[PDB]
Design a protein around this ligand. Sequence first.
Ligand SMILES: CCNc1nc(NC(C)C)nc(SC[C@H](NC(=O)CC[C@H](N)C(=O)O)C(=O)NCC(=O)O)n1
Ligand SMILES: CCNc1nc(NC(C)C)nc(SC[C@H](NC(=O)CC[C@H](N)C(=O)O)C(=O)NCC(=O)O)n1
Lengths: 213, 213
Amino acid sequence: APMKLYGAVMSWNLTRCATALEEAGSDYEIVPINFATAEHKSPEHLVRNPFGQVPALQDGDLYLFESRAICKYAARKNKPELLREGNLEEAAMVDVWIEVEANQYTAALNPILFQVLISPMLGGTTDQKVVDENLEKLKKVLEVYEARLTKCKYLAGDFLSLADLNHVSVTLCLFATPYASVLDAYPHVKAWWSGLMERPSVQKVAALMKPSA
Amino acid sequence: APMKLYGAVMSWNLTRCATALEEAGSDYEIVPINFATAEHKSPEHLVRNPFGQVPALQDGDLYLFESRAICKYAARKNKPELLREGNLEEAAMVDVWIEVEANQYTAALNPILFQVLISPMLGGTTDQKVVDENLEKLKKVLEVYEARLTKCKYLAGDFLSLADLNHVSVTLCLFATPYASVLDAYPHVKAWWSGLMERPSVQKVAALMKPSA
Ligand SMILES: CCNc1nc(NC(C)C)nc(SC[C@H](NC(=O)CC[C@H](N)C(=O)O)C(=O)NCC(=O)O)n1
Ligand SMILES: CCNc1nc(NC(C)C)nc(SC[C@H](NC(=O)CC[C@H](N)C(=O)O)C(=O)NCC(=O)O)n1
């Protein structure tokens, strides 16, 4: 009996777990959730995430939330080589660039991507000040990324981590704007990305969320 | 032998490394970085963290950064009970609530903490509407916490774990500001903090912060 990825396939949080599991090879069924009815906020979803969010990933009697916790369990079933926790120096850095995403990448991206995508489709318009400010930010943050792989071939060094995979969900949405010309004038990160895109679980993902939202 | 933790102790990121370090019994020295002279952007420090912030650990010729990455190292070096790896249900409980603090506890404490401590250092002032408006987000996350620590001794189990220790830092800073009464309305969160104040290692950081009494 496979795993249920709860919540909508639009969200890069959720198209984060599924990049984990599809790369994992896990067994995952996505079960969509109704925000319209508030079913993310029932007793029925107040076992799967007691704040009231998605993703979850139910597994037997397992209720795991948060995106990046969830995306880990993918790793330690499926290819634990994604984690690399045979090595307290290699697990070290895989957790450096796991975190560098949540706090330096996404954190600059998110601001561009709910201004050119969440806000407009909600009736507000693109606030271009706040587009510009985080573009800059995401520039800076893109410098480091270039260096890191101007040297190492990847992010936690020279193997496929959970770190890299964690990057694509939200990055695909840049390519859903014309704002992913940033990715190109840094040459080592661009070509890095393509790599992931080439990989054929970005592709299930990169068509998972393409169709509908 | 010895581990190097860079960054001022006024940072509460930095005091969250340097408390995972204490429980784990590691061997760390805190070398100060200093914001005023911009020691953090020194072409020096950009080798311990290319972004330009504290913390970074130095261990060996290995540098880490990102608080949460480096409280992984401490648990994954000198005390592997703290993560419970090799037990996917318990090791997965832990990662979860490591996101929980990151996204639900601190993500509301942050701007409380900034409003009432940092902000007065620059401009004179605290935005009491910010303070009030993340206060109630924090009252909201508490209630889960109350739910979960009636099910459980500690956060991820009845084991102690990274999980509760990653909280200790900001909760302390929370007793700096006048809103540290909010944990009275929730008795089981009160136990568990005060419980976890008894630890040698929480007090070692209690008086790294305040001078002492
Ligand atoms: C462009 C697409 N962006 C978009 N569209 C919509 N549309 C809607 C149907 C909401 N849904 C989503 S995020 C849902 C959200 N999750 C979270 O932010 C959870 C993220 C958390 N840090 C972790 O990874 O668990 C949550 O529960 N919302 C909190 C709540 O409503 O209480 N994204
Ligand atoms: C007594 C005041 N304590 C105080 N005052 C200020 N701001 C003002 C006081 C000036 N800074 C903070 S710590 C959070 C942040 N570090 C980063 O977030 C680090 C990024 C990463 N997530 C991490 O955990 O290391 C930063 O301070 N680092 C600064 C940096 O970016 O270099 N606290």
